[PDB]
């Protein structure tokens, strides 16, 4: 249904939003290698819950800070269920990139909130 | 990336598949009202796990039998993580529709397996 991008100092993240009835599905990725490392689910009135996927070396992917952050930002605007995937390869990128991805996620979230307000 | 439909005695289900890098995202819906009631996650080597969304009257949605069934059918063909949503309003449809949706899910799953084998 809709694609958004955000950029901070050369690093780019993207969010693809799909409206499935009253329910939402959002894929958040970054850099040049799309991936799903974590999934966070929520409704307007329940606390978001995360499932982590295993990485190749056995560690769980820690990209859930992205999906949980977006979940917290958009929660009050949800008409139904919401499923958010995240994957920016936090196990491979620099600490500065990981830190920058938090305000970048806030920017994608506001872009999404605006789009939802314009397409209720 | 790809859409599939299946039909049994007038009832239709649909699966939208998205390839996100090596990872998969599949939305399974049915009838005339798309929805996400449940989410099942898996990899080729881990048992699928489900999160259920609450319905309006407080009962968890029970459409996860759909996503878990598809997960079991396609698991051995996965290159990475896989996230499957399901929602056919099992809390509103007839018992016969609920029962028919299980072989319909197997048909969508094979359609997906074929598409994956043709687009590795």
Author numbering:
A (entry chain A), B (entry chain A): 1 to 120
What does the paper behind this entry write?
The crystal structure of the purified LpdD reveals a dimeric protein with structural similarity to the eukaryotic heterodimeric proteasome assembly chaperone Pba3/4. The addition of the LpdD–prFMNH2 complex supports reconstitution and activation of the purified E. coli apo-UbiD in vitro, leading to modest 3,4-dihydroxybenzoic acid decarboxylation.
In the case of the H35A variant, crystals belonged to a different space group (P41212) containing only one molecule in the asymmetric unit. As with the WT structure, a functional and highly similar dimer can be made by applying crystallographic symmetry. No electron density for Mn2+ could be observed, but residual electron density was observed and assigned to a bound phosphate near H61. When tested using whole-cell decarboxylation assays, both variants displayed reduced activity when compared with WT LpdD whole-cell assays, with H35A more affected than H61A. In vitro reconstitution of the purified H61A variant reveals this mutation does not abolish prFMNH2 binding, whereas the purified H35A variant did not bind prFMNH2 under the conditions used.
